[PDB]
């Protein structure tokens, strides 16, 4: 419940750094399991969500400083496209016409 995975990646400066994948919740900190043990069970119950009164943060990224998507960006449309494909009927290649006349102007 603390980290769902970890990886070791070599950054552009040649140093190897550890990256941990935090457990997440669906927009609801109440459902989030705040724990400090490698345990799935929700053991810790906190009366004060913010013990030190420090506010949480929801960072907003500047579009100027953004970077083109590269984290499996080729999968964003996969779900919708694949759902449509499941019902789509594909013509067999042998029955599909081939070697048709070229366009006169292309």
């Amino acid at each position: 419940q603390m980290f769902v995975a970890r990886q070791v990646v070599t950054n552009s400066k040649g140093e190897k750094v550890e990256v941990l994948w935090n457990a997440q919740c669906y927009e609801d900190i109440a459902q989030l399991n705040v724990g400090f043990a490698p345990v799935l069970e929700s053991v810790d119950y906190h009366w004060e969500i913010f013990l030190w009164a420090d506010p949480p943060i929801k960072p907003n990224n500047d579009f100027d400083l953004n970077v083109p998507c590269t984290w499996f960006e080729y999968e964003q449309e996969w779900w919708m496209e694949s759902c449509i494909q499941e019902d789509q009927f594909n013509l067999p290649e042998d029955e599909r016409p081939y070697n048709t006349p070229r366009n006169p102007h292309c």
Binding site: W52, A53, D54, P55
Partner: protein
């Protein structure tokens, strides 16, 4: 202030300035410095991590203030419209608890 010529020459020889100061104090004249007022900031350990100062974690007076608000509403409405007043003597031991307390 006056800086000794020999001391100034020593600084120039040992250090060559190649960057401009970013502090705006460089522009201040002697008159501005003289008119400046010194204020002291108390620096200590920091425990509160919010803009708002520490708030008390209990409200005893409010809880009892609400109890009276409940009592006034029930007693006042019953007396004005029902004309009924609770007979505290029926449960005499709760009245005695008040007396004993």
């Amino acid at each position: 202030t006056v800086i000794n010529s020999e001391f100034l020459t020593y600084l120039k020889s040992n250090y060559k300035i190649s960057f401009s100061a970013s502090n705006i104090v460089k522009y201040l004249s002697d008159k501005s410095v003289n008119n400046s007022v010194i204020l002291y900031l108390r620096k200590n350990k920091i425990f509160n991590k919010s803009r708002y100062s520490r708030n008390r974690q209990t409200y005893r007076t409010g809880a009892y203030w609400c109890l009276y608000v409940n009592i006034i509403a029930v007693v006042a409405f019953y007396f004005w419209f029902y004309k009924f007043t609770m007979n505290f003597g029926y449960l005499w031991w709760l009245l005695y608890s008040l007396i004993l307390s």
